[PDB]
């Protein structure tokens, strides 16, 4: 057929009977670092089975009056086993992710999602003088959410979570220029993207620079008649690919 | 120059010690001499010019304020306000000026 | 002692000239480039990318995500109008802030055809048919389904697939068209009518929605670069 | 030549190959051409996409910042850190992309203005200005009558009135492989302090001053600076900024509706 | 050195750098195949997408 | 070379081939040469029709419009929509044809004039003017101290006194394939409103202003604009305008006799 | 540092000169021409066309 | 490049456009056969027009 | 009478430019060079030379 | 091209060839590369040492000395012996080597300043300056109105305001085969008198004056002189000067610690 | 005359001296073997110095 | 800018409603803010500046005039003059000024 896929990595597997095609970044497939571009003076390490697998983040509920969700990418896997462990002892490191989000519904529900992965997503504070603090900008594999109301002004260090501006001050409609897929509960069941390493330096630290952001914005809100299941959860499972690190040090 | 929080709201009880922090970092394009001020709007209350302190300016607050850190050229302009009273409500301005940068911090203290 | 003569146009600073200039730092060795993915090379690699159209403004669905949802419900009478808007992709208050709009708002003359992808984001058991018509200018807007099916139109059916790309053709006397709101170079109107009603089984919502995208065909072009009328400024930041 | 593609003729078909219906879920934009949904005539197309390229869209000068400094005063001189965040007609053209790489061509348009002098029979000769460029880290002057101005090996330019505006070229000066018009992530490993601040794009300062002395009456001048990105290459496009800018450091804003509104969906 | 214009035209480089040459204005090349169709399997126009 | 034809000799004939009598009804102008109605000598002719061609008849600069703007005033600045209908010594040379096609070469001759100042010891440095060109549709400035001037990517030119007059070249900017110096027919499909108005020849505006400030005494300036149609090609010639123009939009007039008169038909 | 000398006749604006000039809009692609009928090429294609002569003026 | 004048003269194009070249001044070609004799059948001079 | 146009950036003195210049004393014959030992040719022949590090400052 | 050397891969060895331990007594600096004490990846290196060469380090103009001279005064004129010892931002760049050899490119940036005149309606035309260069031994002028100025065959330059700054080139003028920036040893065979003084680097004087006369009000001018060592070759490098200079003749100083201090050896 | 830059560039000498030519800027040659290792017997890296 | 009829003659009877129309179109070279005036020469009678109406200027005509259309930015400057009287004879000037264009209309009303 042409509806089924079977993705495997490391020692994990993802299978979906009903899904659309897979969108591969900007046309490039994630690979290691060639030696024309390398800048580190030493030799990097490559676990290659201990990290390249599918970690599963926490779940989120898709209520009728939902607004959105976002995860900061090389920060959400900070606590997932060997990836988070190699992310601490080293100093540099590049990766390439294979994001997969999955939300299933029956044939009697209706709704739609926009699964976009905006690179270098800089967000704006609620107060025009301050900037958002770390605690309210991201969470360890936890989903921060947008809102439908403009956040007030008396808040000191918070994020402006008005969804019609995507938090970045940009129009929410024009977000499709980035790689994306639509979760449409009519015909689609799962969206999957393959995002290479996008940054202006060959390697970078991973505790100070969240060089991606996976957003989910419900355009056509969920709706159903009385009787059907009132609880429809969403679950995203992210998997690094072609990872390597440099510069050993102590823990931090 | 850049202050971590250009304005916030602080609340302390009368008779406590008031912490009014003022942190900053230094961009590469800053190489001039250091200058740090502190204002109050109910008027300078303490200066740091030429690596020496001049802090007898506000008669209402004599000795009731003094810098905390011993590395004032590293990004610490905080002041230790002790023995809070009722006539100490007013907006503070941590004005630091290193050539050629400038940055402020508006601390509105309420009690 | 070569003899020269200075023609008019000397000692002037043209804002858009291309001349050589003495280097400020000689023998500076720049850092070698890197194959960073996603290299744009012509701003017509952005007009090709779809972007939803806020076609439900209604003065209160604007400050929300409702501006992009087109109301489609199970009507009782046949032959009702769903939406409709003039096609001026630089002056209209609908195609203005789309991804095509902020590329057109830098140039003045454009050309080529435009596609309009629709996507029925409704339930899974519901069907229906819609008539997407594009009436070239000269008369008013069409007001009856009998009138708009005279122009160019597609009769969309919803099934397994969930889209239908009405491509408005390039039908105009001039080789280009202005992006400002003019009358000498109007570009017609776009409408969308009920072909047949929207039917649903029991225990399924009758209020469905539709999204609409916009993009350019592979014969788009622009000209006569200018600045945008959107961003103002009174003092420096 | 960068010509656009012409259109080929068609005939009224009746087959099972439907080009119209597709699936927009796949994130794959349509690829149909009008020759696939109606009858078209073979039209040779001579239009050209040359004036929409990157170097025809960016290589145009735009004012960035302008300062004033009086003659008859102590430390009458203008400083300025080099950044494009301040003017908004140019800031927005550089936010359409994330990683740019270009070399520059400055240009200064210096003017003068006689101040309300008080003596009698005021007459001053032509003026001469100096525009000193300090790399990030060098020593900075404190006043006009200072010895960091002459005894220096920084690049500076001397210009006098009534002539063509000066102009120098600056190559690609950065630590990485592209300027970053956006940077999400802190600058201290402890994740404190300022949020969107990067050393990657720093370029130094610009100190300007008079060279003459105070003859009889003050003279306030004014200098305007113009960029010109050449040899530019852009990466990772980005949607255009909608909400009005508020600060020069971060991207703060106030929420505003997507578009201006109309009276009804069918009008 | 000598090339065509929008007949011919002559250009000569004077200074001994690279950031001193004039603008190019003539890099006419595009490839939207990485923004329009960034999918893994090729999509044919006529046959349905599923 | 474009030489004219010489004349060939003739002899006194007596035949049935009459070249003189023809029929002017056929709308076919005669084609006789003096060698067909009298005896002529073989005269080599070296005259040349070069200085009567189109590019020798049109490619000569001609003032179009000139405006004044004071320095010491608010919004002291000149605007002008670009059209050749206003001056009549050039308008008539462009009405001889219907569809022209040319690229342009502007030229501005800016002058100054000191106003009746009131303070003592007035002395101003050299001045600098800016001539901003706004395409049709761009944002227009409202006052001199405005931020649409610097932060802009429109083509503008900066010029200071005592030098050669500025000059820029503008290519063929139109929507059709030729400028229309005439257009009979309305501009609304309902056939209402203005009569002879066309979007085909619009070219934008021109905003000009001072760059200096108000030192001590006002300075009123003046700018004159000069066209120069090059590469021109003309189509569908037209009789020359006789009645005096009255307006810049339409072709209104008052009726006037064909020629000045004489005392009698035989004088 | 080529040595040049400026001859008289510089920094002047002759009304009927022919020189090159910097373009205001670079890389502007004009619209292709059309074979419009009736192309004049020399104003001596108008002197060849007959026109009636007002030879009875007589002031009324 | 090098051509004759009203001896020879040399011209060099500098800018990289087409609307920047100097005037032509040397397109000497005429054809009044479309304004003088715009008739369908050829008209000979000698023989009468009818 | 060659026609020229003066581009912006004229009559300026850039501190780090490289142009030719008229000689002040023409036909000056310099004294011939001598093979003096220890010829540096790039300031990266000085960074290669060790130098003790004052790593016990301690303010006294 | 002057490229730096890349780094070659390595494997974990266990052998008797120790590259780390060496003997620093031999005055032979180490020569190890990181590929000899750890595992490295083969990194192609494209960095270039071009902008660190001698001619990229020295051939940049630097102010040397500047003097003022009034118009309305007797013997209002500036003299200066040619030496680089006076300004310290350039002196230190020339002490890094002992024997330099370069030809020069002077440049003078002359400015004027109107003095507090007393009459009414002061107005002066453009000024003209003369910069006379006297070789070591020639006759020197005593006042402005003197006949050693015109009737002379020394190299001088005449310059008037509002134009580009003058510039002349001076070849390698010395008695030895290199300028000596240091000379230990007296200058009299009896070992008396001044200590570090050498005839090897003398270059003469520089006399400057006005050319106009005293019209109605004094005018004080100012001239700045800029060097530019070209074709330079350096010999016998030298550690950089630490203690602050005090005089222009000798190398006197006051003792100062090696570096600024820290609180403890482990911080 | 014509040489490469940091493409090509053209340089022409006008004056009849040698101290009038522009700066060289392109003498890229180094040899630290007289400052780093100024010893009489060659020192190999691997084997010990004694 | 362009008015359809820069001047005409209108005739109405006393006690009727007087229609003084003022239509216009917008050329492409017009992009400034909108301004519409109305004069009388027996003095402004109604303004439209900044998308808001200011129309209490002529004491003789209070409430007796008001714009007709609800799309005043589309080319409608007409006024609805009601209850015509005998002191309302005079020439009207519909002066509309959109940067950078200007156009007038001379309505000479006679009764």
Automatic annotation (TrEMBL), chain A:
Compartments it resides in: Host cytoplasmic vesicle membrane; Host nucleus; Virion
Superkingdom of source: Viruses
Family: Belongs to the picornaviruses polyprotein family.
Subunit structure as annotated in this protein's UniProt entry: Homodimer. Interacts with host GBF1. Interacts (via GOLD domain) with host ACBD3 (via GOLD domain); this interaction allows the formation of a viral protein 3A/ACBD3 heterotetramer with a 2:2 stoichiometry, which will stimulate the recruitment of host PI4KB in order to synthesize PI4P at the viral RNA replication sites.
Role of this protein: Plays an essential role in the virus replication cycle by acting as a viroporin. Creates a pore in the host endoplasmic reticulum and as a consequence releases Ca2+ in the cytoplasm of infected cell. In turn, high levels of cytoplasmic calcium may trigger membrane trafficking and transport of viral ER-associated proteins to viroplasms, sites of viral genome replication. Capsid protein VP0: Component of immature procapsids, which is cleaved into capsid proteins VP4 and VP2 after maturation. Allows the capsid to remain inactive before the maturation step.
Name of protein: Genome polyprotein
Classification of source organism: Viruses, Riboviria, Orthornavirae, Pisuviricota, Pisoniviricetes
UniProtKB/TrEMBL annotation, chain C:
Localization: Host cytoplasmic vesicle membrane; Host nucleus; Virion
Ranges in coiled-coil conformation: none
Assembly with partners or alone: Homodimer. Interacts with host GBF1. Interacts (via GOLD domain) with host ACBD3 (via GOLD domain); this interaction allows the formation of a viral protein 3A/ACBD3 heterotetramer with a 2:2 stoichiometry, which will stimulate the recruitment of host PI4KB in order to synthesize PI4P at the viral RNA replication sites. Capsid protein VP1: Interacts with capsid protein VP0, and capsid protein VP3 to form heterotrimeric protomers. Five protomers subsequently associate to form pentamers which serve as building blocks for the capsid. Interacts with capsid protein VP2, capsid protein VP3 and capsid protein VP4 following cleavage of capsid protein VP0.
Family statement drawn from the similarity comment of this UniProt entry: Belongs to the picornaviruses polyprotein family.
Name of the protein: Genome polyprotein
Protein's organism: Coxsackievirus B1
TrEMBL record, chains D, F, J:
Keyword list, A-Z: Capsid protein, Host-virus interaction, Viral attachment to host cell, Virion, Virus entry into host cell
Pfam families: Rhv
Domain Picornavirus capsid: 35-201
Compartments, as annotated in UniProt: Host cell; Virion
Main location: host cell
Single GO BP term: symbiont entry into host cell
GO molecular function: structural molecule activity
GO cellular component, one term: viral capsid
UniProt KW Signal keyword: no
Protein name (database record): Genome polyprotein
Organism: Coxsackievirus B1
Taxonomic placement: Viruses, Riboviria, Orthornavirae, Pisuviricota, Pisoniviricetes
TrEMBL record, chains E, H, K:
Localization per Swiss-Prot or TrEMBL: Host cell; Virion
Function: Component of immature procapsids, which is cleaved into capsid proteins VP4 and VP2 after maturation. Allows the capsid to remain inactive before the maturation step.
Entry's family note: Belongs to the picornaviruses polyprotein family.
Subunit structure: Interacts with capsid protein VP1 and capsid protein VP3 to form heterotrimeric protomers.
Protein's name according to its UniProt entry: Genome polyprotein
